[PDB]
Amino acid sequence: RVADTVGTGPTNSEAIPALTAAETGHTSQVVPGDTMQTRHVKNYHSRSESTIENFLCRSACVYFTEYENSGAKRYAEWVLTPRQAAQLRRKLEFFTYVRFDLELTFVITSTQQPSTTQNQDAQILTHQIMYVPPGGPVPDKVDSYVWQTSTNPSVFWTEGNAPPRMSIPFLSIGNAYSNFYDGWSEFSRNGVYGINTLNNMGTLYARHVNAGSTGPIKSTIRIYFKPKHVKAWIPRPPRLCQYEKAKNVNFQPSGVTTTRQSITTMTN
Amino acid sequence: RVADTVGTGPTNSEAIPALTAAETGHTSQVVPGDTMQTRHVKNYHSRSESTIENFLCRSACVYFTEYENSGAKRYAEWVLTPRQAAQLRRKLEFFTYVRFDLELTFVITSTQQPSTTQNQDAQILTHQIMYVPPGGPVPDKVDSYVWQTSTNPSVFWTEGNAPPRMSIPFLSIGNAYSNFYDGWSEFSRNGVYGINTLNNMGTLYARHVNAGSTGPIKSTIRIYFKPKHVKAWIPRPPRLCQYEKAKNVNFQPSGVTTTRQSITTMTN
Amino acid sequence: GYSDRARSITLGNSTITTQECANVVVGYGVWPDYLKDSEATAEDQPTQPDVATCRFYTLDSVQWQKTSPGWWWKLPDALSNLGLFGQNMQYHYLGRTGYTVHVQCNASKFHQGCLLVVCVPEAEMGCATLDNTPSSAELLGGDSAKEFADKPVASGSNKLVQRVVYNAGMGVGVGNLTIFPHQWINLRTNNSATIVMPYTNSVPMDNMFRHNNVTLMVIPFVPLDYCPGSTTYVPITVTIAPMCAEYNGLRLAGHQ
Amino acid sequence: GYSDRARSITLGNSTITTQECANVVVGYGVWPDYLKDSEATAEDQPTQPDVATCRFYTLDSVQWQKTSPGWWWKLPDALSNLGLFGQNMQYHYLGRTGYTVHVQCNASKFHQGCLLVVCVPEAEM
Amino acid sequence: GLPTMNTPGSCQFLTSDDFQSPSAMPQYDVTPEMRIPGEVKNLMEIAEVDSVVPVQNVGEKVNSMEAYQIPVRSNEGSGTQVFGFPLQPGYSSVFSRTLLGEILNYYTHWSGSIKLTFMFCGSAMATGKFLLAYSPPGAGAPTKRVDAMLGTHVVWDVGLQSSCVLCIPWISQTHYRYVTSDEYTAGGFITCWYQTNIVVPADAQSSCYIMCFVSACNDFSVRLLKDTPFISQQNFFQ
Amino acid sequence: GLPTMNTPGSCQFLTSDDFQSPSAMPQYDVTPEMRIPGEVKNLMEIAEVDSVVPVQNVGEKVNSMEAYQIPVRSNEGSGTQVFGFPLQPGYSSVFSRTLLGEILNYYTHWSGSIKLTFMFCGSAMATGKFLLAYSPPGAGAPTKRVDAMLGTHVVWDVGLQSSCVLCIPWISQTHYRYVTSDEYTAGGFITCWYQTNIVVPADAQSSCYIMCFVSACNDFSVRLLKDTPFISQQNFFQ
Amino acid sequence: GAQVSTQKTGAHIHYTNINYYKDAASNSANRQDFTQDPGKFTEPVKDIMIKSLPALN
Amino acid sequence: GAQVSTQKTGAHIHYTNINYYKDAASNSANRQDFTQDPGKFTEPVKDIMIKSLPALN
Ligand SMILES: CCCCCCCCCCCCCCCC(=O)O
């Protein structure tokens, strides 16, 4: 609940609430009843939508990719990294360090491709999604043994029902996920610079378990993140500039803001 | 429970319950046992269907619109406004101010369009519906970045199961939704006149996430409102005339009622 | 002893006396009061002019003829140019007030007629051209009354109000206007009509120039009649008293 | 702690701040108040506009030159056309008020001069 | 996995259902409530208020204020009729457009007593006497004052108080009636007759008007919510 | 088998929902927490911090540090204007890119009072007086000091403490305003005028600069989370 | 924290309800609120009018 | 072991919740944690600054 205004009256004193000194790096805690006469107002507004948990706990698409039931591109791979979509990236970069659980949701949708093959009568498609932590083997092909998922987490989904969804705990060797890193991987102060140094999150693969039809089909998978139980530290200023790559903070210089006509104009 | 009639007998007195004066703007509270002899009746009828919550809490179609999986019209947009359907509009306009929660239900149905394309074997269609509050970006195209819904509420629905349904809280900067507004937007007493001045409700967009087939398909979405927890003030007379537009109270003059043959005729 | 016909109302430096009147109608059961602290929004301290603004302002008279469709007045606009009430509402940004409307019409025992007096909250009116919305010069005429019509207004490419009377400009049935606070002036019984309307709105305060909260409608359901030899000029007078008027947001003078 | 040079005055929706000022002069020892009942004469009820009339009105500035004899202002007339104070004094017959006059002139440490500010009651000329 | 079983009626959209749904805007601060005059908690608080009845809905009279006037003048005879209409509060054109009628249309069944108030709007020198009557069904409508005198009637004496009330009681075989036209639930007939005459002096108008107001009593009730056959549209409004 | 019934809204993906899901990594030991300075628990702890306002966003000045400077020099006159802009904390270019503005864009409604701090950055020999003003809507913007003096104003005397505060209070008809441009919820105008003059001695600069900082008071609040219209992308970044 | 209430039954049995969501805007409609007060509209006059009394005296 | 808490309702009702999984990382988001402390950022100085006092004395 926000503070309630206190009613004040006329004053003639040596107190100076308005006069301050901003060189001390301190924000003035002046209320409106210090520079004018006010009335008593009973405020009932709540700050319940400005909480970091409410500001960040909403699903967002961070990536989508395609694969086919025939031909060359038979499976899809994606090193996990949220810095490909602009919206969630810009929301998180408000802080230097964060710490949250994750809620993953996948929207898998198929489409029939144009072709001249006849007598097509497709059976329901089943998809497999597999997570490989850094260090494990990778699926060089579509029908390789790695898809046995003896230890690797994986989800089997048949087209036509509720989208698959899982919960991931805070996976980090450190005490918090670093949104920014000012340093290198090597002690020789050369090599990889920036936050790509701390991006050791694993890889996600996706395939069709059966081909379904005799004609071509392309399946697209969209990945959705949703932070839970969020903690955050050291707020930073917003990006302002437009992002360029997913591994670094590079930008093109942009003006402070948009302009107007004069210093006295009340119009954009 | 309605009141119970009291049994009365013959009277000869200077009391005058029948004689009153209607110029005082007061309705006479005369019961039938004031102008005749009655018997004692134990009434058990209830006024449980005349309540505003029961009168207004029923789903109604307020709009429907179409989009396609190919071609030009690839997505659908609709500024939220209930004054397009006559039935719910006329029910609400019984009062000057209302205040309610909302229950949204969507009936999305697809149809195959006539065409000469062959070997059509469609996969299940998934739809996305997205709400943009006033101020946010808009989807200029179908595959634009705005569909990432980082903060904007949205619903993913696969054809074949229960219709999507959500709950919306009373969203208003004021203390009640104004069904009528007698004024302008500008202090210059010119510009937009009427209730269009207070219509700052956002926009709803709808699209196909996948194309499904190689042939054409048109999907229609029907929107249903259902007020809950209703409060209402200052009852008004019913419309009588037929509505013309969605933004104003314009009408064509109509007779008070329908006619009969004479002042003594007992037939329509 | 005393009678129910006689009644005096004192406000400011104004006293209204009547010797043949019906009971007073008090709004929706509510008496106009001031805005409380648990219901306010604007933080600064408001100014209450009291006697200077809460008094009886009389308007021009209109003539009741044998063929008069009726009249209406946008209450806030009607007094926007009278005394210190208009000045306070011209120098401030937000305002709040209730009203006390007294309508007077006197005639003899050989005259007949019946007038409906109704305070309609948020009487949004319609245009004769479905394409546009009506002008401010058509809707609100200050320092004067606005007349209804007996026939429908023609369409075209203008911004005229649909002043047909049996539709009340609001596109309803006129006989239902008795759902709002109302009073009948019957020449054989009544003489005047008093209505004490409180502040109705969906916000705690409002700008008083671009929004009209209520509207006074006077319609003669039963026409005026008499026999040759009696008085032919019969006027109708309207007196409005603001009640518990307060103002917030002092600024420069003007309305733009 | 605080100093005697700094002083803020709040009236209505107006606040005056000063960082180099002398002590305030309060009339003849009396602070402006309202008319009491044992001292009134007019029988009807008066109207007190309060915040709308009791606030700081600034006037035009005058230039202090090396050869300026001086200036004067008839206090009641000066504000007869400003805000709601002028309107209330234009629609009424009798009025009663005290005043708070703040005169400001700033210059550097390399300027010199001295101005006398005096509130003269009933200065018949 | 708790073993369950789905019953007929799953994944169906019944428009009059009552469930719980996930909120689209979670943890949203709703604007506080303020006190607004005239809060409505039931539709029978509206139907219990008077409203003027258009009895003279004959010809072009519906396009004026003449529909609400009931003409009554000096008659060189006695016992003639003033007006008549049936007790059909939601179907007859006399009643289907009033506040009571309008609210009744949204429902299928109604019950309770009815109030008809009459206001005399002549001069203070006119005097009269009228005989308001209600006749339950079973015979026709009464065609003279000797047939209307036998029902539920009031004799209205005109003077000072210029307003009389005729209460139509509930005389039915069922608990409820139908809002639509149905012979099995016929209501009866309401008529008005001259008791003596309207008498005036010289230099006064021998033609006056009456006005009618209809409302409902405390026992009034409605059931079966339905759509009103008045409003209609061809395409979505814009 | 416990007999159940599915309701409308099953197998749907509402992005703002709150349920429980099976964990992919069961019985996983999470790294212990450590104490990090500067923990944030609300977005209004950030908006309540000052940030410099680019008032001189005119022409090429946006591509330098001149956007943040407000030029004030010695004037051979009096009562002229220094600057002016509208009270639109999230839509006007003066305010849309500051910490307050940035946070406001992610929401639809705002409420509360505003702080504008001004720092004078001349020499210790310069003296001045200024008249900061806020005018609620209803008229235009004030065009002279005789029209700005009538609103909520402060007279800033320049000396020693080189920083004054103008608090813009909440003067609205609604509880909340809109972050986007809407006439129904217009805010007002903020202007600054010369009270007397900037006076300097010889061998000192007669041209100085002022700086502005904006922040929110204790009563500030936001509602309706939405997407910001600033960030955008054409293809997935790499 | 189940809420047991009474069902709508004829004249001349209970049901159970549980709230599953933390937003009060998700609950079921308030169907049983049979409270009426027609006095704001039917009789809004300043002076009381006894039924068996001359309205004008 | 059900947990009954209060719902988010307007100003001027309860809900029930049960945990089904043994991993605390599967629970619902912590929406109602309205705790703010802006003193780390707005006023981080070593010496206290009284509002109605000259910042530099
Ligand atoms: C069967 C699929 C299981 C998928 C398991 C995914 C586990 C890895 C989750 C990666 C989360 C990355 C969070 C980065 C946060 C940051 O640094 O900003």
Ligand SMILES: CCCCCCCCCCCCCCCC(=O)O
């Ligand atoms: C994913 C879709 C979410 C949709 C969210 C819709 C939120 C806006 C609801 C608009 C309600 C408008 C009520 C108008 C009432 C009135 O003024 O009569």
